[PDB]
Symmetry: C3
Subunit: 277 residues, 3 copies
C-alpha cells in the first residue's frame, strides 16, 4: 500500500472532556476521549477542519506542530485562539506538498510525524493540560509513502507512558512480518531515550532508508525531549523472529520505575515463544 496524492478537504469533530482521576482527553465523539488522543492521518495537500467543542469547566485549546495553520488557529490565549468552557471553535489545519519556490529553493512539505496538544490548561503553555492527557498524534503522508498494517502511538509524558501507572505497558501485538508503524512523542519536563529490542530504524523522516544513497544513521535508541516527535516503520520480527520484544526508556531510573512495555510479536499460529504473560 502507498499513500496517494492529497488534496481533500476533510472535517472532523473533536471534544475535550474530563476523564477519571483528574485527567483530560481529546476524543472524536462525545464520551469517547482517550489518552493519547485520536490519531489524525492526512496526505500532503489535505485540509482538515476540526470542529472543536470544550465540554470541560476550564478553558482548553488545540495547538498543532508541523502543519500549516493561520494565527487564528494557533490555539493560544495570547491570540484569543482558545476555547471557553462549553465553547466551540473550528480549528483549520492545512498541508502542502514539497516543491521548488520561485526563488529557486526547495520548500519542505508537511509530511512527517507530528502531534497536537493543549496550550492553556494550568498555564499559558498548557503545562497542566499536557500533564492531564491533552495530547495526540498526527501523521501527514507524502505521495508514495509506504502504508503500514498497524500504527501505535507511544508518548513519554514526564515519567509515564501514555499517562498510565508505572509498570502497566502499554503492550502492542503483531504477527511476524507485519509492517508496524510507531509514532513516538515526548511531553513534559524530562528528556528520555527510546529503545526497542530486536528492531532498528533510520534516523530520517520516514524511519526507512530511501535506498543505498541515504547516509542517515541506523539506530535502536533515540534521545528525545518535550514536544519532540518522530516515527518509523519496522517489519515485525524481521531477521529476529517471534517473541516478547521489550521497548522502554533507557534512562535507567525511568525503566526501573516502569516506563517499559512489550512489542508482542506472534508466530502465524498466534503464539509467542518464551513469553508467559
Amino acid at each position: 500500500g502507498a499513500a496517494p496524492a492529497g488534496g481533500e478537504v476533510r472535517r472532523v469533530t473533536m471534544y475535550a472532556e474530563r476523564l477519571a482521576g483528574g485527567q483530560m482527553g481529546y476524543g472524536l465523539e462525545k464520551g469517547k476521549a482517550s489518552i493519547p488522543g485520536p490519531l489524525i492521518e492526512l496526505n500532503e495537500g489535505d485540509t482538515l477542519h476540526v470542529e472543536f467543542e470544550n465540554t470541560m469547566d476550564v478553558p482548553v485549546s488545540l495547538h498543532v506542530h508541523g502543519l500549516d495553520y493561520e494565527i487564528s488557529s494557533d490555539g493560544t490565549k495570547q491570540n484569543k485562539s482558545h476555547v471557553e468552557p462549553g465553547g466551540t471553535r473550528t480549528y483549520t489545519w492545512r498541508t502542502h506538498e514539497p516543491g521548488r519556490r520561485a526563488d529557486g529553493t526547495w520548500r519542505a512539505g508537511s509530511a512527517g510525524y507530528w502531534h497536537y496538544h493543549d496550550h492553556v490548561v494550568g498555564t499559558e503553555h498548557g503545562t497542566g493540560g499536557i500533564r492531564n492527557g491533552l495530547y495526540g498524534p498526527v501523521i501527514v503522508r507524502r505521495k508514495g509513502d509506504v502504508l503500514p498494517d498497524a500504527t501505535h502511538t507511544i508518548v513519554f509524558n514526564d515519567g509515564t507512558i501514555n499517562n498510565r501507572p508505572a509498570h502497566t505497558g502499554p503492550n502492542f501485538e503483531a504477527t511476524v512480518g507485519d509492517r508496524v508503524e510507531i509514532v513516538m512523542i515526548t511531553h513534559g519536563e524530562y528528556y528520555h531515550t527510546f529503545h526497542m529490542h530486536g528492531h532498528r530504524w533510520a534516523d530520517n523522516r520516514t524511519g526507512m532508508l530511501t535506498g543505498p544513497d541515504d547516509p542517515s544513521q541506523v539506530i535502536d535508541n533515540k534521545i528525545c525531549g518535550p514536544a519532540d516527535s518522530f516515527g518509523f516503520q519496522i517489519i515485525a520480527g524481521e531477521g529476529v523472529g517471534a517473541g516478547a520484544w521489550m521497548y522502554h526508556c533507557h534512562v535507567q531510573s525511568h525503566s526501573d520505575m516502569g516506563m517499559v512495555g512489550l512489542f508482542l510479536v506472534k508466530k502465524p499460529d498466534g503464539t509467542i515463544p518464551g513469553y508467559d504473560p
Copy 2:
C-alpha cells in the same frame, strides 16, 4: 543572493568588557559589548585575525567551535592561550572548503552554524564567563549558500534567553515573505527543546532541504544541550500568514518561567492581525 567563494584574509578587533550586574560580553568596539556577542560571518576559505583585548580585571579567553585553529588559538589556560587582564592577543581562525583527499575520502568543509565563548572565567571550562554572557555566533557559508534578508541569534543560556530577565523576549520582526535566518546556540547546565509556532525547517546543515532527494526530517522542535549550535532559514509567514508567532523552549517548566519570545510577522502594510501585548 548567494555566498561567494571565500579566501580573503580578514581582520577584526574584539574586546571583552564588564557589563551591568556582574555580566560580561564581547564587542567589536570599546563600550559596545553585547550579549550575545557580535555575529561573525565568513565564507569557506576565509582567514580571520581577531585582534583581541581584555579590558576586564580577570583573565578571559576566546574559544571557537568548528573552525580551524592552531593550538595557540585554543583559548584555554592549559595551552596558555588565554588573555591576562588588560592584555591583548591575536586569535587566528581559518576555514576550508570541502574536497577529495588523496586517499579518496571526502574532507568535510568548515561551513555551518558555530559559536565562540569564554573558556577561563570562573573555571578552566569557562563556566563563569559563559554564565556571565561571554558567547556569540559564527556563521561559515559555503559557496552558493542562500543569503537571508536578516539573521537573529537565540541563545538558551541555563534558564535565560540571551541572558535576559525572564519573560522579556527577545522579539524579532519580519515581513511576510522575508527569508529569515535563525542561529540557535545552547549553553550551561540544562538540555532544552527549541520550538517555533507556524514554521518548520529541515534537520540538516543549512536548515533547508537540498531538493526532493534529501531525506532529513522536517521538524519544528529540536532537543539541544550545552554548546550545541544549529541554524536554519525560513520564509516568514509561508503558508500561514502574518501574526505574532511564538518561539519558546518546550520544556514545560522553562516556558512557564519565561523562556519565550515572539516572531512578529507583518503584512506588507505593517499589520499584525490580532497582536495585542
Copy 3:
C-alpha cells in the same frame, strides 16, 4: 587507507563476566583479563558471531546487544530467561545482514553502524547495577567498502564518569598528525551529556564522514547523547589544525568542571606535543 570487505564469516569467541576491584564488573575475552569498557567487537555486515559466554560471578548476568540481529533466546533478559546463572555458561549468537531491496521494492537497512553491548539483569531487570559497575562495551559493524582506521578509541559517558574512571583521570588517547582515528562514543546511566572535541569535527551520519558533496548532514563538533545512545566517527588527527593536546569533554558545564575531560594527544612526527606541559 584499508577498506572493509564483504562479510559472511561465522566466528566464535569466548567472553567472561568477572568482578573487578572496588565493586566493579567487566567483560573480557580471556579469563582474568576483563576490562571496562569491555573488548571491542568488530564484524563485517553478513558475519555471524557466537559468543561462548561464562559468568564467573556470584550473581546472574546477561549480554544484551544493540542493533545486531539476535533471536529472543539471545535477548539477554530475565523476561525470556536468556540471562546466565552464577558460574553458568551460554552461547549468545549475533547475526548481521547487508542492506538490500525487498521483493516489494522497499529498502532494508543493513546492520552497519556503531553499537554496544551491556548487562541487562544485575541489580534490576534493566541492568542498572551491572551497567553502573562497568558491564558495557563497543560493537562496530562495517559495511563493505567502509574506510578502516589506524586506531579505535572508545569513550563511554557512564553516569558522571568516563569509562568508570576516577574523576579527572582521562582517559587520554595518543595519535600522530595525519593518523586516521576512529572514536566510538557510548552513553549509559541516568544523565544526558554533550560530547565535544577541540580542534576536530565530524558529520552527523552513520560513518561520521560525508559520503561526498551531496550529503547534507550537519557537520558538528558537539553532540547531545543520552543513556544507551551510541555513535562514532573518524577524524584525521590534527587535520588543518596541527599537533597539540586537544581536549575532549562533556560540555555540560558542571560535568566538565567535575572531571569528565580527557586529552586527544596529537603528536608531531618527532613524537613531541607543542605546549603540552604535564
